């Protein structure tokens, strides 16, 4: 899920990576703006019976 980011990228910086080597912030090639990256919601499913 994208989201506008207040993050600062240097002019040569296009991808901001995570601890697990995953991009958690990107810069759109067309418009030079920084977008926040977040994997969609997930979780276990427990059935109570």
């Amino acid at each position: 899920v994208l989201t506008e980011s207040n993050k600062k990228f240097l002019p040569f910086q296009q991808f901001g990576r995570d601890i697990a080597d995953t991009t958690d912030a990107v810069r759109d090639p067309q418009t030079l703006e920084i977008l926040d990256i977040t994997p969609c919601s997930f979780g276990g499913v427990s059935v109570i019976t």
């Binding site: 600062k8 240097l10 040569f12 910086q13 296009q14 991808f15 901001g16 990576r17 912030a25």
Partner: protein, 34 residues
């Protein structure tokens, strides 16, 4: 002559951003106090 480079010649190694983290990189650097 000679002089001491205390903590000079440190740059950003890669084209990636990081925040509030300590990162370790192997790259051509200027040794401290050289």
């Amino acid at each position: 002559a000679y002089t001491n480079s205390f903590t000079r010649g440190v740059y950003y190694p890669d084209k990636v951003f990081r925040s509030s983290v300590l990162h370790s990189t192997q790259d051509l650097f200027l040794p401290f106090f050289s």
